[PDB]
Scaffold this active site. Structure first.
Site, PDB file in Angstrom:
ATOM      1  N   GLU A  62      58.668  82.648  35.153  1.00  0.00           N
ATOM      2  CA  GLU A  62      57.702  82.385  36.384  1.00  0.00           C
ATOM      3  C   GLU A  62      58.372  81.413  37.042  1.00  0.00           C
ATOM      4  OE1 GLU A  62      57.106  85.469  35.497  1.00  0.00           O
ATOM      5  OE2 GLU A  62      54.800  85.036  35.537  1.00  0.00           O
ATOM      6  N   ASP A  63      59.608  81.634  37.854  1.00  0.00           N
ATOM      7  CA  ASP A  63      60.131  80.487  38.693  1.00  0.00           C
ATOM      8  C   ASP A  63      60.037  79.201  38.159  1.00  0.00           C
ATOM      9  OD1 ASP A  63      57.880  79.575  40.445  1.00  0.00           O
ATOM     10  OD2 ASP A  63      57.722  81.548  40.312  1.00  0.00           O
ATOM     11  N   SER A  64      60.244  78.884  36.767  1.00  0.00           N
ATOM     12  CA  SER A  64      60.130  77.545  36.326  1.00  0.00           C
ATOM     13  C   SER A  64      61.651  77.006  36.430  1.00  0.00           C
ATOM     14  CB  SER A  64      59.499  77.503  34.999  1.00  0.00           C
ATOM     15  OG  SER A  64      59.321  76.122  34.232  1.00  0.00           O
ATOM     16  N   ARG A 108      62.835  86.464  45.662  1.00  0.00           N
ATOM     17  CA  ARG A 108      62.817  85.785  46.995  1.00  0.00           C
ATOM     18  C   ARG A 108      63.876  86.129  47.911  1.00  0.00           C
ATOM     19  NH1 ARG A 108      58.731  84.649  44.529  1.00  0.00           N
ATOM     20  NH2 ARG A 108      58.070  82.885  43.458  1.00  0.00           N
ATOM     21  N   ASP A 146      54.368  77.505  39.154  1.00  0.00           N
ATOM     22  CA  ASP A 146      54.946  76.900  40.433  1.00  0.00           C
ATOM     23  C   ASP A 146      53.982  75.925  40.885  1.00  0.00           C
ATOM     24  OD1 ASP A 146      53.180  79.018  41.200  1.00  0.00           O
ATOM     25  OD2 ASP A 146      54.134  79.191  42.970  1.00  0.00           O
TER      26      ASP A 146
END
Ligand SMILES: [Mg+2]
Ligand SMILES: [Zn+2]
Ligand SMILES: [Zn+2]
Ligand SMILES: [Zn+2]
Lengths: 41, 40, 62, 42, 357, 287, 103, 62, 61, 424, 97
Positions: free
Chosen positions: E106-108, E262, J53
């Site tokens: 999760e885009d960590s 993205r 995020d």
RNA sequence: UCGAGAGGUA
């Protein structure tokens, strides 16, 4: 001549002209000019 | 304009309330924890 | 901000190489040749020596 | 002990009304740091 | 030059069409519009970089400064013409696009514990407290507590560690009443300076600045130059990272799944360009080849992918920006090469402890 | 079923640089040795800093952090005891076993800027003198006045925490590949294709012999395991022209120290610490 | 803090597996991949050992779990001790070789 | 750009070809004031009133 | 700050801001440019169809 | 009478705003050494509809014993396994888990030896299957295990699964066959997770957790990365040139198809009939007028958009011809974890059609080049003078891609198209 | 059709126009597209069925999958009083009245 | 502290 200047010379001149423009006016000059005009006139 | 009047008064006085014993923190990912377990 | 020491990524001591780097840049040496003269074979140390900005001079002056 | 602004002089003033520097005229004072030992964890 | 007498005017540079916060972004035209907008609007403002060269004269609230600001390896025509290093706020770290035990989902973001402990992405926060008096400044309420640091003048001595429930500015009346200002639950730090000033009306003003060094914690949020934003999911020891042939471990590890969604090309191009610039061009050649390296990353004057691949190949590495890595836990050689490059990253002002309630 | 018999051949050895080849061993042993020498070998470094005069523009915590990263000679690191283990003292000032005191005092009384390097750092024990390389590591730059006086204590620590007690600097090991050439499909290739194949290698791993007009293997240890020559051969239409595979039982180690300890001494300390870890892990039999 | 073994807790604990005969799990406290990987690789050299592996389920909890399955010829603890002794002998031999090479 | 209401504005939130080189079209604030606030370009100058009168010079041209 | 040298300015501003703000009560205030319709061009609108001549100084529309 | 929080306590976790009832999940407290943050399993992100995020999850600690008792009996995660909206499973594999499962079930050419298989067996609950690969070469010992048998240790022995679309057959808990598609792994009517939930419903969470851990370990052993080669989408320079020419020709063909489709109006019924018309050349000579007519008319714009999508499906189909199997983008698109084919096409080949729903005063001059921006008669310069125009429906095609870069006019077109997303 | 005036029903006016071609149009399936007046034309049940069909189409367009019982319950709840009331407070007040 | 106006987070 038209092509006597050369391609690289034009690129260098563009960079120098941009530097001169940033040195003359700076990042902020519109506000300074507007305030100076209001005070003078 | 207090902003707490009319429908907003109802929402902030009877419908939406704040309670004690509550915590709010940013969440991160931990694959080691089980699906039903939360890291505190 | 003085030159960072210990080359965060690698771990090599680079604290005492800033003066030598500036002296090499004073002569007719490019950045790559100056870094090679300092015996920096990993590009992380070269980045650390190349991306540093000398800010302590303005702190002392101002 | 308080340090003045553009002028180098120690005011050393503790009165409530004394806020202006002596023989300077400016009213900006900086608190001076004394010789105290403080420990930090590197 | 291709066709003259048909163009009345010419543009000095196409990158000057964009704003100051947008022209400095490398490979801007290679990124999606939404991510460029995010980077140029929010992430540029939220970056932590140069605060000021004269912090003494300023008593502004919430002043933050990075310990070791670094300029990017790549160059921009706008930045070169402006001749200011304050445009870029942040540090460039080795970033590897790979999965790490699912801790970067999760885009960590997964960062190297060793690299941070050496002084990377470390910033100082200075917070100022102001009190106005037209009751006077002084230390009162003997034996009441939380007034040990207060001096006779009513202000703490410089160098005192201030915690919650302690008086930072001491104001007392002649009758013994204490209109003092204390520190709240989340307020802490070490006092830096005390400034006393008064206006022409005669009102006295007092300013006390508390400073505290901030180290990257888990909930800290970091952003890239191309709109990639995430939080620090996990901190891994240096020995566990997938070291390369020359032992260069990545400082930052990001999940590959963020790129297809993205739609941010150019960040890989930026990494490849920075790697080519930083890597030593030896070639066993006496000729000075370091003066023929592609360094500029002007958005509308970006170099082609072929030139970047050729430059990276001349550095002794794979032309595609990926290198063979070995697992740090077992020592085995991974089947697929991992893309690694020194991208430029920014530390946002949002912190985990600031969101704790 | 029993132990292995590794063989060690040293190619180059120096005070801070050592390069040796390890053979007849598994990858796990080499990886464990690397991890131990990079994160388990203890050294001495400054951890506690006490200052009295901090008129310098730099903050106190910044100065302490950059003081803690200064490399120090750690010849006594193995013999010294940990601060938590040291029970003779609670920890204050100089100790005979754990704590070493450092004193620094700098005052600038000249117009020229004064640089506070690591050379003007004095300690009671001469054996813990900071490593000298040059002008030394610059700590703080001082203008006229701006005194800086501090007292520092250095303690033994492991490189796992704070990553400042790690003497190793990117210790590496490779598999030492072996290059196999069919030598029959090369004859079918033309002279032009051989040059293109040579240029495909990112590093100088293959050479062209002018006398025999055929490619040869030169410096096989710099292959870096980049599948560029294999991909080029596959593109040219020769699938099995060049076959390169890593050697599982052969390794080449590169150890670079920070000056705290010698590289050979670093390897010896890593081996001793691994042996001690194995002894501690060893479990007694139960009936 | 993390380096110190917890007070009152032994480093190695023995727990037999009831489902599978000649199977046991060794829980090594305050250990990392360094010891686990080499122990696992040394156990594979033994012919009697059938299953040899280690895991680190929780990075925060510094523990190592080692599972050993052997044939009807030796106990898992015996194979564990034999592997440890062989690794110690290998370390001694490597130290001797390095000392000889330095001189 | 001032608008009476924020939800209903019209085509003022979208980039225009007149923005070319004057105000940046790639960077705008996200939210209620999306496109209402526009960042000026690097080569951006604002004209000022001229004291001199160009009426007399215009007749000289023809 | 303007005029003369900048040696005294070194003992002062940090030389990082060119200066476009106002010090009202110790807080920096910056003007934001306001976009207004041009008053020196004929304006033609629809519904209803009309053309208007703007006023320069006095309301002579 | 108050005690501190400890292990075993239940806290009601929520992510604001609560769009559906599954946002409220009762989770057992697990104390961790980390501070100033809360740790959550990445699989549980789907019920909360949030990512790591900067999202803040605020929990509620029940004080009364009755509330705690009702919390883990109705709001527990195991109680909410079945989604109440569509009747399917609430929890899926996740990005990394789905990608790793697809890779381990698709490759079939990578074999795991005894050591790696036993190392991976620690996380799997079930026992190790037979190697099924005794000898692969005359001189190859150490019999190996296939990748599909590794995924077979995630199913109970009594479990039986059959997915005809992907040719998936599971007998006695062993994955017998699989061809392609990865539809059974993703959430759907016949996903394997739903069948497992309908089978036992007692150990499904443990199975999912063990599968995630094992797949993470396997992917770490393999390694997944995105490099410039993936964006290049070509084996060499010649392949890239061929792909570029093919994309250009496909875009030209799509434009011609759109121009042909625009003629399906009542004004050209005399031309569309089978008769003798001398104005055939005039229909193809006016190429720039078609764009102006399309931008002014909304029905024509919709027809052109539909025709362009229909023709551009074939253009998007070229990625599989010019894409390698090892490409990370193709793997993630086929697995369904993240992205799709169109995003890859925009990454490498071409962005494609760019149209805006709202009406604007300008129009894209069909070329997006420097010369077009200087044409006074282009739709971008107010109007084309063909009597003036007041509103336009912008319609532009971008031949370049993100990898190759965008000229300022193409970037302006993209920004105009995408500005609508940032609105509130 | 044109809603210039609400004096006459649009459906009834359309029926009067299609008199010469009554046989061509299949009046057994033809119905107004609107939901509000479909109840007045063909009854509450026909309007409910058309509303259910439109709701299913909207859900399919949204891309999500929703069980039939939810939509059926919504349809039966919005037409308890035999008239499809609005979602505003006025409709709720009228339904309660 | 009780309010208002701004700027940001998901
Ligand atoms: Mg989010
Ligand atoms: Zn380095
Ligand atoms: Zn004075
Ligand atoms: Zn001691």
């Amino acid at each position: 001549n038209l092509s006597e200047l050369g391609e690289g010379f034009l690129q260098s001149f563009c960079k120098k002209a941009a530097t001169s423009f940033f040195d003359k006016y700076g990042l902020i000059s519109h506000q300074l000019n507007s305030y100076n005009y209001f005070i003078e006139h | 304009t207090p902003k707490l009047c009319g429908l907003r008064f109802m929402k902030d006085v009877l419908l939406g309330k704040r309670s004690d014993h509550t915590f709010r923190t940013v969440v991160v990912g931990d694959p080691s924890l089980k699906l039903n377990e939360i890291g505190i | 901000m003085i030159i960072p020491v210990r080359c965060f990524t690698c771990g090599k001591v680079i604290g005492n190489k800033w003066d030598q780097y500036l002296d090499l840049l004073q002569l007719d040496y490019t950045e790559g040749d100056a870094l090679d003269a300092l015996q920096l074979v990993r590009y992380c140390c070269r980045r650390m020596l190349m991306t540093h900005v000398d800010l302590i001079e303005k702190l002392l002056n101002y | 002990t308080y340090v003045c602004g553009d002028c180098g002089q120690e005011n050393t003033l503790k009165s409530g009304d004394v806020i202006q520097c002596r023989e300077c005229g400016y009213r900006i004072l900086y608190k001076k740091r004394t010789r105290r030992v403080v420990q930090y964890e590197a | 030059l291709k066709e003259p007498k048909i163009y009345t005017h010419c543009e000095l540079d196409l990158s000057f069409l964009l704003g100051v916060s947008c022209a400095v972004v490398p490979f801007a035209n290679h990124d999606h519009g939404r991510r460029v907008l995010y980077q140029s609007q929010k992430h540029c403002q939220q970056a932590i970089g140069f605060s000021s060269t004269n912090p003494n004269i300023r008593c502004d609230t919430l002043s933050q400064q990075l310990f070791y600001p670094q300029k990017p390896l790549f160059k921009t025509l706008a930045s070169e013409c402006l001749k200011k290093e304050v445009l870029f706020n942040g540090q460039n770290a080795i970033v590897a696009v790979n999965v790490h035990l699912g801790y970067n989902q999760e885009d960590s973001i997964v960062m190297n514990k060793a690299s941070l402990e050496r002084g990377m992405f470390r910033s100082e926060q200075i917070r100022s407290y102001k009190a106005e008096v037209d009751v006077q400044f002084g230390k009162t309420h003997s034996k009441i507590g939380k007034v040990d640091s207060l001096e006779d003048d009513g202000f703490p001595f410089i160098g005192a560690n201030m915690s919650t429930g302690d008086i930072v500015i001491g104001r007392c009346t002649e009758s013994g009443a204490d209109h003092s200002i204390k520190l709240k639950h989340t307020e802490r730090g070490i006092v830096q300076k005390v400034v006393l000033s008064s206006n022409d009306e005669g009102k006295n003003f007092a300013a006390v600045s508390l400073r505290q060094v901030r180290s990257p914690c888990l909930g800290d949020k970091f952003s890239s130059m191309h709109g990639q934003k995430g939080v620090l999911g996990y901190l891994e020891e240096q020995q566990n990272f997938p070291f390369t042939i020359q032992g260069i471990v990545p400082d930052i590890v990001i999940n590959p799944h963020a790129f297809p969604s993205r739609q941010t090309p150019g960040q890989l191009l930026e990494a490849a360009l920075s790697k080519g610039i930083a890597c030593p061009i030896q070639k066993e050649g006496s000729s000075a080849a370091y003066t023929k390296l592609t360094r500029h990353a002007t958005p509308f004057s970006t170099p082609g992918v072929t030139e970047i691949t050729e430059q990276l190949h001349r550095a002794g590495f794979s032309r595609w920006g990926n290198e063979r890595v070995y697992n740090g836990r077992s020592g085995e050689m991974m089947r697929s090469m991992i893309f690694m490059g020194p991208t430029f990253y920014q530390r946002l002002v949002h912190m985990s402890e600031d969101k704790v309630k | 079923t029993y132990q292995r018999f590794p063989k060690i051949k040293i190619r180059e050895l120096k005070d801070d640089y050592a390069k040796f080849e390890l053979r007849e061993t598994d990858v796990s042993m080499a990886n464990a040795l690397r991890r131990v020498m990079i994160s388990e070998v203890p050294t001495v470094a400054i951890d506690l800093v006490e200052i009295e005069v901090n008129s310098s523009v730099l903050n106190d915590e910044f100065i302490a952090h950059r003081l803690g990263l200064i490399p120090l000679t750690s010849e006594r690191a193995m013999s010294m005891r940990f601060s938590r283990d040291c029970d003779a003292c609670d920890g204050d000032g100089q100790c005979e076993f754990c704590s070493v005191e450092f004193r620094l005092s700098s005052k600038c009384v000249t117009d020229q800027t004064l640089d506070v390097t690591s050379r003007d750092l004095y300690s009671a024990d001469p054996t813990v003198t900071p490593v000298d390389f040059h002008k030394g590591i610059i700590i703080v730059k001082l203008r006229r006045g701006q005194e800086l006086k501090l007292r520092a204590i250095a303690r033994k620590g492991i490189g796992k925490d704070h990553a400042k007690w790690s003497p190793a600097a990117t210790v590496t090991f490779m598999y030492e590949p072996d290059i196999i050439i069919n030598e029959d499909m090369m004859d079918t290739l033309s002279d032009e294709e051989k040059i293109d194949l040579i240029e495909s290698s990112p590093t100088k791993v293959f050479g062209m012999d002018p006398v025999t007009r055929q490619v040869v293997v030169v410096d096989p240890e710099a292959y870096t395991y980049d599948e560029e020559v294999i991909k080029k051969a596959e593109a040219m239409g020769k699938p099995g022209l060049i076959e390169i595979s890593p050697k599982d039982d052969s390794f080449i180690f590169t150890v670079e120290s920070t000056g705290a300890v010698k590289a050979s001494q670093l390897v010896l300390n890593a081996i001793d610490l691994l042996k001690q870890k194995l002894d501690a892990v060893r479990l007694s039999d139960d009936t | 803090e993390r380096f110190v073994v917890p007070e009152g807790t032994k480093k190695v604990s023995y727990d037999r597996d009831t489902k599978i005969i000649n199977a046991a799990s060794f829980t090594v406290e305050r250990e990392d991949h360094t010891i686990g990987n080499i122990v696992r690789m040394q156990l594979h050299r033994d012919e009697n050992v059938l299953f040899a592996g280690y895991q680190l389920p929780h990075p925060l909890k510094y523990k190592i779990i080692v599972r050993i399955h052997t044939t009807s010829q030796s106990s898992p603890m015996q194979a564990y001790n034999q592997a440890i002794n062989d690794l110690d002998k290998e370390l001694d031999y490597l130290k001797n070789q390095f000392e000889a090479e330095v001189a | 750009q001032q608008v009476l209401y924020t939800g209903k504005v019209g085509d003022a939130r979208y980039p225009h070809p007149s923005h070319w080189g004057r105000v940046c079209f790639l960077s705008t604030p996200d939210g209620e004031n999306c496109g209402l606030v526009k960042n000026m370009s690097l080569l951006g100058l604002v004209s000022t009133q001229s004291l001199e009168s160009v009426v007399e010079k215009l007749f000289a041209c023809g | 700050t303007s005029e003369k040298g900048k040696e005294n300015c070194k003992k002062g501003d940090c030389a990082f801001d060119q200066g476009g703000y106002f010090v009202i009560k110790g807080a920096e205030k910056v003007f934001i440019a306001q976009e207004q319709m041009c008053t020196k061009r004929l304006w033609i609108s629809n519904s209803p169809w009309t053309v208007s001549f703007r006023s320069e100084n006095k309301r002579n529309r | 009478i108050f005690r501190s929080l400890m292990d075993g306590d239940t806290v009601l976790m929520n992510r604001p705003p609560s769009i559906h009832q599954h946002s409220l999940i009762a989770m057992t407290v697990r104390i961790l050494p980390t501070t100033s943050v809360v740790s959550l399993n990445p699989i549980c992100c789907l019920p909360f509809r949030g990512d790591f995020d900067g999202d803040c999850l605020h929990g509620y600690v029940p004080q009364s014993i009755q509330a705690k008792v009702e919390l883990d009996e109705l709001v527990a995660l195991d109680k909410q396994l079945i989604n109440r909206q569509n009747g399917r499973n609430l929890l899926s594999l996740g990005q990394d888990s789905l990608t790793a499962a697809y890779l381990v079930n698709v490759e079939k050419n990578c074999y795991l030896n005894r050591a790696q298989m036993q190392q991976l067996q620690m996380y799997c609950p079930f026992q190790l299957p037979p190697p099924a690969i005794i000898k692969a070469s005359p001189s190859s010992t150490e019999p190996q295990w296939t990748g599909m048998q590794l995924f077979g240790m995630l199913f109970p022995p009594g479990f039986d699964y059959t997915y005809p679309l992907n040719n998936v057959v599971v007998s006695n808990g062993e994955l017998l066959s699989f061809s392609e598609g990865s539809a059974w792994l993703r959430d759907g009517e016949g996903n394997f997770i739903e069948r497992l939930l309908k089978h036992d419903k007692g150990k499904v969470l443990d199975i999912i957790y063990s599968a995630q851990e094992m797949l993470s370990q396997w992917l770490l052993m393999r390694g997944l990365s995105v490099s410039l080669a993936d964006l290049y989408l070509s084996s060499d320079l010649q392949s890239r040139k061929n792909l570029t020419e093919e994309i250009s020709y496909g875009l030209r063909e799509a434009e011609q198809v759109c121009n042909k489709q625009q003629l399906m109006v009542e004004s050209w019924r005399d031309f569309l009939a089978v008769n003798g018309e001398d104005k055939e050349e005039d229909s193809v000579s006016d190429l720039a007028r078609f764009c102006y007519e399309r931008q002014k008319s909304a029905t024509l714009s919709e027809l052109a958009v539909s025709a362009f999508k229909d023709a551009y499906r074939d253009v998007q189909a070229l990625a599989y011809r010019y894409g390698d199997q090892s490409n990370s983008f193709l793997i993630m698109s086929k697995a369904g974890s993240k992205g799709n084919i169109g995003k890859l096409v925009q990454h490498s080949m071409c962005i494609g059609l760019q149209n805006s729903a709202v009406s604007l005063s300008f129009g894209f001059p069909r070329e997006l080049t420097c010369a077009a921006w200087n044409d006074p008669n282009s739709p971008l310069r107010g109007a084309k003078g063909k009597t003036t125009t007041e509103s336009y429906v912008p319609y532009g095609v971008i031949e370049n891609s993100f990898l190759t870069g965008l000229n300022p006019l193409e970037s302006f077109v993209h920004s105009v198209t995408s500005r609508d997303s940032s609105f509130s | 059709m044109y809603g210039d005036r609400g004096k006459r029903n649009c459906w009834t006016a359309l029926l009067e126009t299609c008199l010469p071609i009554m046989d061509m149009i299949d009046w057994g399936r033809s119905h107004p597209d609107n939901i509000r007046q479909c109840c007045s034309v063909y009854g509450i049940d026909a309007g409910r069925s058309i509303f259910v069909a439109n709701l299913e189409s909207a859900v399919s367009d949204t891309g999500k999958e929703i069980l039939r019982e939810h939509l059926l319950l919504v349809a039966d709840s919005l037409s308890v009083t035999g008239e499809f009331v609005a979602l505003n407070a006025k409709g709720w007040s009228k339904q309660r009245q």
